[PDB]
Amino acid sequence: DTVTIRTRKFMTNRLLQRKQMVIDVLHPGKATVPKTEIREKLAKMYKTTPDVIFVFGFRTHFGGGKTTGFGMIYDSLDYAKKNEPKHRLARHGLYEKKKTSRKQRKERKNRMKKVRGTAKANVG
């Protein structure tokens, strides 16, 4: 119960339907606390559900009892899905990337240049 959360530089982004802030977490004798653990303490701090809380960029200071990061709280999960980066949604389990490679797609692209017409589709 020795981990404490404070926020600063708070501002409400009505243009992106969210609140944004800088988070300082104090944890004098522990390791850097998990982002899932931080997300729950902000849900109680701001009286909302942790489904719309996204935190990132946490750095621990030398010696170590304080970590600084950034935080966003969205009005709704729909607005979060609209405005959030698609890599920060996958961390919460809400986005799946395609399991290919730049080389794979590029080589496939250059093979279809040689083919003309609908026969482009039937090219591997």
């Binding site: 004098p28 004798g29 200071h61 030398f62 010696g63």
Partner: protein, 180 residues
């Protein structure tokens, strides 16, 4: 084209004569008195003082009411007072030329933690600082060349998480306790 910066400096200058007997004795005395590691640590402070004396000599050739003299003279004097090298009642541009290397070497954290009684010698202070036992204002510092600002002299203490403060004993006492 890259988003990189290539600005860097060298922080010392070597002496012109490599085997000057008078300079070899003078520099080893400073090394031994302040517990320094190598001669390069004397040439660094000496370089910093040489650049301070050179700015003062250039300001002293301006008019006494030159706008740049009163702006960058006050700044230099205030900077020298802040770290504790120059006195509060000697803020004149001619008293910079009376400064010495020993004044700058006395404000190191290694010298200060010893002079405050935390360490039993100037070589115990070095290892105490490097082993993460000392803090300045809730921040742990392990750089022996950390120049102590004047209004930081009172906030040099043992670290909160060290065997010499309120922390747990190190690995050796823990291991010997279970030996029996």
């Amino acid at each position: 084209p890259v988003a990189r910066s290539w600005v860097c400096r060298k922080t010392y200058v070597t002496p012109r004569r490599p085997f000057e007997k008078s300079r070899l004795d003078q520099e080893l005395k400073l090394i031994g008195e302040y517990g320094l590691r190598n001669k390069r640590e004397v040439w660094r402070v000496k370089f910093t003082l040489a650049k301070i004396r050179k700015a003062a000599r250039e300001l002293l050739t301006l008019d006494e009411k030159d706008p740049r003299r009163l702006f960058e003279g006050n700044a230099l004097l205030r900077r020298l007072v802040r770290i504790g090298v120059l006195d509060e009642g000697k803020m004149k541009l001619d008293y910079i030329l009376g400064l010495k290397i020993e004044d700058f070497l006395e404000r190191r954290l290694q010298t200060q933690v010893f002079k405050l009684g935390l360490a039993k010698s100037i070589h115990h202070a070095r290892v105490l600082i490097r082993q993460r036992h000392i803090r300045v204002r809730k921040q742990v510092v392990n750089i022996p060349s950390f120049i102590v600002r004047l209004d930081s002299q009172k906030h040099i203490d043992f670290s909160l998480r060290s065997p010499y403060g309120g922390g747990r004993p190190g690995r050796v006492k823990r291991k010997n306790a279970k030996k029996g």
